[PDB]
């Protein structure tokens, strides 16, 4: 058994679907984060302003809601933002499928602790939640993440899920247990994982036109919804933005400003995914910008590089095979459709 959840468009670079919480049921809007494997909920304790311009799950109100002991917040800070709440567990629905006893992260406060003066990326969304689709490494708390959770309690559905990404129309979705060819045109080629936290494949070579910048250390591609743009290392982002300048542009002649732009290649042994001027791009004011953002996933000698859902996914679909005993955990490419 296979069943779809769909994704809204936000004004916001948010793609987020419908998730009911609690009994009676409460309806939240998360985004679905293949970059982390916790479930976020933002709550009625949170009493920001950009709290309160959202809907708020109540746990007073929730009759299943049961609270977990933690000797402190947990709190999660990245690039943009910080996150920081409290933990319970509650029962969830996705899809019309059911998840019980699901430990979740209540969202108690979205003040940045990067630099306390402003730039917060709660102000410029309207954020009411994750739902971590990461691996269970990821797991801050709990027994047992989302995902797992799910397909424990719905034995008929298979370990995996995909992503058709398609802002201009309302056709976005997430597929749970399958795929489906109305999707994809063309083959999929499978990628194995080889580090079991992210959704983290090797990088072989990477290409920007026929300069070879990647790759003389061990570099990973990490395959990130949760992100709109794409990451490089900082050593690379500086030749980066040596090769791939920022234009004034419009929209009448961007078509004519990239045409000397370069092609993009992301080499996986064998397989060639090309991205081309069009589609790393972005234009945004007048002003036409890589796609790009610099991100050190922190390791001893390892580099990632992110494919984000803006600039990747809007053109690949995507497929995440979770590993069993029958098969290992994949990922799969292929060609979106128009
Ligand atoms: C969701 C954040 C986390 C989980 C706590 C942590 C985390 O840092 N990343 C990545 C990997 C590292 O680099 C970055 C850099 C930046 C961003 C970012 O600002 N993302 C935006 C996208 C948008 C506006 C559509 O929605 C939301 C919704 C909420 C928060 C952020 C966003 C994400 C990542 C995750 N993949 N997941
Ligand atoms: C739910 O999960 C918790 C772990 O947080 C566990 O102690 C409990 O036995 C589980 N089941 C029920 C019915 O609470």
């Known amino acids: 058994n296979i069943f779809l959840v769909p994704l809204k468009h936000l004004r916001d670079s948010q793609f987020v ?18 970059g982390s494997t916790n479930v976020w909920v933002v709550t009625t304790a949170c009493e920001e302003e950009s709290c309160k311009k959202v809907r708020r799950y109540d746990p007073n109100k929730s009759k299943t809601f049961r609270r977990s002991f933690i000797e402190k ?5 990245f690039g943009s933002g910080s996150i920081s709440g409290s933990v319970g567990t509650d029962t969830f629905m996705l899809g ?12 108690e406060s979205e003040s940045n602790n990067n630099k306390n003066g402003g730039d917060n990326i709660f102000d410029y969304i309207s954020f009411e939640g994750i739902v971590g689709l990461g691996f269970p490494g990821m797991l801050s708390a709990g027994n047992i993440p989302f995902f797992d959770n799910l397909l424990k309690q719905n034995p008929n559905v298979d370990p995996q899920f995909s992503f058709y990404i398609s802002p201009y129309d309302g056709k976005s979705t997430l597929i749970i247990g399958g795929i489906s060819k109305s999707f994809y045109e063309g083959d999929i080629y499978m990628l194995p994982v080889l580090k079991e936290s992210y959704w983290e494949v ?13 790759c003389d250390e061990e570099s990973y591609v990490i395959f990130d919804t949760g992100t709109s743009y794409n990451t490089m290392p900082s050593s690379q982002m500086k030749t980066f933005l040596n090769l791939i300048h920022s234009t004034a542009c419009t929209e009448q002649n961007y078509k004519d400003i990239l045409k000397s ?3 993009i290649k992301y080499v996986f042994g064998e397989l060639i995914i090309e991205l081309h001027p069009e589609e ?11 796609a790009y953002m610099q991100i050190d996933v922190p390791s001893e000698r390892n580099h990632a590089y992110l494919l984000g859902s803006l600039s990747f996914m809007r053109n690949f679909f ?21």
């Open 261 to 263: 732009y370069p092609i």
């Open 96 to 107: 019309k499928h059911l998840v019980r006893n699901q430990t979740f992260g209540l969202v």
């Open 202 to 214: 090797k990088l072989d070579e990477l290409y920007i036109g026929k300069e070879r910048i990647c």
């Open 318 to 338: 995507t497929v995440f095979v979770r590993g069993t005993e029958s098969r290992p955990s994949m990922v799969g490419v292929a060609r979106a459709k128009s």
């Open 73 to 77: 917040n947990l709190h999660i800070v």
């Open 17 to 34: 679907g419908e998730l009911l919480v609690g009994t009676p049921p409460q309806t939240v809007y998360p985004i679905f984060d293949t």
């Open 280 to 290: 790393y791009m972005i234009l945004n004011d007048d002003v036409c910008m890589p």
